[PDB]
RNA sequence: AUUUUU
RNA sequence: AUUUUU
């Protein structure tokens, strides 16, 4: 929204693989993984709208608060004809292999750089969507029990 | 060199075809493909080549036993669900607990109720009392593909248990499928 | 098909319509200096994406080399970056007489330790990392006069040891990483100790990766004129130093499951 | 070095990462100021050890004496309906102590990057190290500072939106601390 | 002469101030996904003008000889 | 063939680099370079080649005269305000205007005033009463480069006359450089 | 401005070599000179403004 | 002094070259300078201190 | 390779004979030469050929 | 530093 | 259907 400031939060979340539908069934699958994962933003906004928004990423940090990004895995995004910039972040444990269902990937957290502009026939505020896949370097490792019971 | 395509900048409206294995990058990164076992755990022979529980029956006089086998929302053969069409060699594990007798087991993707009735010729494997067996029912189905949801996306399993006195018991089912052909992925499941 | 032949249908026209005077119209078209592209910059960790970019710009003749030919200051131009590597005093604690063998003289948490307090050159990066990977170079110092004797026992311990120190048998601590040191002979101890644990990293602030100690071999025989005041320090380097995982400052994050 | 990579990054990640790329300031470009204006500016270089949650913070400290490079990267974004444009150019210290005794409409003379809004969302500049000295005390304000002037007022429409923030980015093309000293105490390379 | 000069004049420049440690900086230049192009199909006596287009999609290693 | 570009259409933001020596053309129009003379005067070693008034002080006794050497804001040299940084070789012009007497001149780019209390290897060239000199100091600043506008940006200059008997006068200077290197070009200056 | 007529005059004036920062530092350093003069006017309008 | 500290400080100072007789007459001489200087601390003790 | 003598580690009752022009190193460190000037403003020929008020 | 001149 | 394994 126009009305977030030009440092204000538009979104702050701890991701976890279960928070992705596809990841999800392999995480009540698999017990253990590895590889980089891939978040794809996209802002459905009109072609007059203009604005800059930064979303980092801290690798498997916990405190859900909001800080700055400087040192973060960030990525700037410029509205322009192709609304869907992504972020990737490497495979970060203390193993080669990690749980599948344990510890956080880490913070994530989209700021706003730029109040989004508009005009007289423009929407003043847009929606957005979050999606998350695997890296081309994805691999799971051991089957494990479920956690939970699809329909 | 690098494109600003590969880098981040993209658009969700360009993804068509399904299927794009296209690289990421940025400076001081790169896919790396580590292995820590000499061999994949993700390939469908390999994951369901393992079984997984079904269901337990307890039988008390020498009746019959007919299943719907289906795919199951429950263990790890759940990453199933992610596909809509099956097709392949089926591997089903019985457990016969009883103290004295004979287990009759067949396998038929046939739905008349009347063809199992015999066992003719539905593969009436027997597994002697307290033993164990795994048969591998091949695709005997009149459908080409088997919808993976359906109630009875895998064939029925019948068990017609020959007991000799009083004795009772139950018998346990687990499955697993020897190489499956899975196609068309949909989307994923929800949780219950 | 159209819509950009205005130029050769106005250079040839006139082309074609001159007089000795050559013609009289000339038409040139082609593509605006602001096109439709989009520009892409990554930095450490970053990337900038921006789809209406303008031509960057610079100086004059322009050195970008940023190296500076006089030299005005003598060091290597690699000197910050492993500034961090540095050796530096990790410990000084004072052997008191009259300490049975087996007594622990002094320890030292691995591998925080380094980044002990806002003083240490490795303290800064640091805390930009919440995972480490490295090699460590001690050289515990200990002097005493010639007229004095004694014996101390210099051992790596890793986090497994250290966690059943009192399940192990002393006397057998010659086992680990050692340097049984007989004072009056050596005055300092070398240990060359690589990155052990049962994780590929190591959370940064943390007593993983085992700690240093220093025990008493054999109590110090101070003879009566002799000296009593014995000093024990532990100064350690970084063979080889590796800060992965990215973090807010000196913010606690679990790379452990 | 950890074969199986469990951190996948660089192995020089940790060493780059203070030239890394960061937020150097946030300003709104409030309407009705006119031309010359100055919406912005950053002291340059200590503007890249701003906060403690700079990556360039932790070495910065412990040394006295820097030479660098930087790459600026100025943003504003504004709608298409709107228009106008800003001037962004770097001062060295020479410009920045005798500002007032320049003539602005001349600055074109300096690295910039006259940004016409409504074209433009970032400007780009690259800047190599530049004073008269070889090395520069580490948490001044010399080698200059990078401004970001109006060069022609905002012309917001009735309906448009009213609130545009210029963003500067600063990244070290080539970063070089020398003089060891004790954690940020002020020390005179200088004479 | 501009306006896409962005990635030879920040790839070069990194390049030329570039240590042991490799170059600081990469920058990449090229055009959009969505260009602007104009697409035609025509059917049994129909013809679709499509002045907006967007890249087609399709199943998984398709087979359409159907 | 000529692009638009040429013609007149561009875009102010697509300037940089700085220094982009592009050619503008028309119709009945091309860039005509006309010579008059054998050389430039536009050169930076030929204009500052040629000396400028700078400032004149008058001696009664045998006192020294200390002033911080700067770029003028005055004349041809005005020029040099153009840049921010200067190297290179200075000549100085020294007019010693008096009866009987000599006159020592010496330069240093040391700001310390005691260095020059006493004159031991501060250059002091001798210029006998009613005479005039002209020395060429050379770069000895302990910076590698001179903002040129600092009220010192030239090294100080040193007059110790040594007069003999009550006679008094002016020494009038003026001043030029060798063959200077002027970087990073800045705003041009403002009118008082 | 819009309101400006189709034939009215948004700018006019004579011009001389003093009215430029930077030449008019020539200006007040050589005598003479010779060449052509290049002006650029650059309009800042909206992307819908023509 | 055995007495000091094992972290005590046994001389501190700022050190200006004219601190040293040598040195100090190329000050009085020499206004510039440049290149690294060398402090060379001789502790005379006996065979048996350590 | 170098010597723990050209480290720091010496005697100062072995400097004779008189004239010892040894190098001093450590890591990160060399003796860097750079010049300023076309030449010696140290040689005696130079330095004393300037005269002096007596 | 053809950063005196060719 | 190296859709047991190489």
Redesign the interface.
């Known amino acids: 929204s126009?009305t977030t400031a030009?440092?204000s939060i538009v979104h702050r979340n701890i991701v976890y693989l279960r928070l992705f539908?596809?990841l999800?069934?392999?995480v009540?699958?698999?017990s253990y993984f590895?590889?980089?994962l891939?978040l794809?933003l996209?802002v459905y906004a009109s072609?007059?709208?203009?604005?800059?928004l930064?979303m980092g990423f801290?690798?498997?940090?916990?405190?859900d608060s909001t800080?700055?990004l400087?040192?973060?895995?960030?990525?700037?995004?410029?509205?322009?004809?192709?609304?869907?910039?992504?972020?990737?972040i490497?495979?970060?444990?203390?193993?080669?292999?990690?749980?599948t269902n344990?510890?956080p990937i880490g913070l994530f957290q989209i700021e706003v750089?730029?109040?989004?502009?508009?005009?007289?026939?423009?929407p003043?505020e847009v929606y957005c969507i979050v999606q998350g896949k695997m890296?081309?370097?994805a691999?799971?490792?051991?089957?494990?029990?479920?956690v939970?019971?699809?329909? | 060199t690098m494109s600003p395509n590969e880098l981040?900048?993209?658009?969700?409206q360009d993804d068509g075809p399904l299927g794009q294995?296209k690289?990421?990058?940025?400076l001081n990164?790169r896919?790396?493909?580590?292995?820590?076992?000499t061999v994949?755990?993700?390939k469908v022979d390999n994951?369901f080549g393992?079984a997984w529980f079904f269901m337990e029956h307890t039988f008390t006089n020498e009746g019959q036993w007919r299943v719907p086998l289906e795919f199951p929302?429950?263990?790890?053969g759940?990453?199933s669900?992610?596909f809509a069409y099956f097709t392949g060699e089926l591997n089903i594990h019985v457990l016969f607990l009883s103290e004295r007798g004979f287990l009759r087991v067949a396998h038929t993707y046939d739905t008349s109720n009347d063809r199992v009735n015999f066992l003719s010729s539905n593969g009436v494997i027997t597994v002697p009392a307290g033993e164990q067996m795994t048969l591998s029912a091949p695709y005997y189905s009149n459908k080409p593909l088997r919808t993976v949801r359906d109630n009875n996306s895998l064939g029925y399993l019948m068990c017609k248990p020959f007991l000799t006195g009083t004795s009772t018991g139950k018998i346990e089912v687990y499955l697993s499928l020897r190489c499956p052909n899975f196609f068309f992925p949909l989307?994923?499941?929800?949780?219950? | 098909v159209g819509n950009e032949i205005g130029g050769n249908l106005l250079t040839k026209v006139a082309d074609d319509a001159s007089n000795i005077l050559g013609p009289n119209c000339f038409a040139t078209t082609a593509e605006p200096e602001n096109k439709?592209v989009?520009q892409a910059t990554t930095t450490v960790?970053?990337?900038?994406?921006?789809?209406?970019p303008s031509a960057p710009t610079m100086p004059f003749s322009p050195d970008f080399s940023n190296v500076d030919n006089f030299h005005s200051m003598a060091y290597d131009i690699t000197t910050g970056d492993k500034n961090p590597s540095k050796l530096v005093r990790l410990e000084t604690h004072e052997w008191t007489p009259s300490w049975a063998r087996g007594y622990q003289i002094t320890h030292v948490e691995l591998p925080k330790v380094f980044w002990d307090h806002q003083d240490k050159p490795a303290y800064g990066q640091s805390r930009?990392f919440?995972?480490v990977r490295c090699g460590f170079h001690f050289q515990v110092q200990v002097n005493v006069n010639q007229g004095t004797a004694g014996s101390a026992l210099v051992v790596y311990e890793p986090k497994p040891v250290v966690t059943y120190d009192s399940k192990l048998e002393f006397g057998a601590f010659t086992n680990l990483p050692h340097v049984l040191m007989n004072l009056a002979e050596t005055t300092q101890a070398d240990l060359c100790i690589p990155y052990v644990a049962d994780?590929?990293?190591?959370?940064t602030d943390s007593s993983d990766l085992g700690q240093l100690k220093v025990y008493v071999w054999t109590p110090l025989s101070i003879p009566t004129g002799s000296a009593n005041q014995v000093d024990v320090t532990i100064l350690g380097s970084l063979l080889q130093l590796d800060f992965?995982?990215?973090?807010?400052?000196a913010?606690d994050?679990?790379?452990?499951?």
């Open positions: 126009a030009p440092q539908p596809n999800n069934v392999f009540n699958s698999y590895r590889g980089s891939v794809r996209s072609t007059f709208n203009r604005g800059r930064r801290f690798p498997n940090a916990t405190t800080s700055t400087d040192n973060a895995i960030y990525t700037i995004c410029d509205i322009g004809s192709d609304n869907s910039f992504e972020i990737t490497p495979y970060s444990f203390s193993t080669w292999m990690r749980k344990g510890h750089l730029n109040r989004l502009t508009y005009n007289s026939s423009s003043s890296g081309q370097d691999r799971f490792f051991c089957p494990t029990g479920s939970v019971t699809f329909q | 981040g900048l993209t658009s969700a294995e690289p990421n990058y940025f990164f896919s790396m493909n580590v292995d820590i076992f994949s755990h993700t994951l393992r929302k429950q263990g790890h759940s990453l669900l992610l989307p994923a499941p929800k949780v219950t | 439709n989009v960790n970053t990337t900038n994406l921006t789809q209406h930009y919440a995972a994780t590929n990293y190591v959370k992965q995982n990215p973090r807010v400052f913010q994050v679990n790379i452990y499951d």
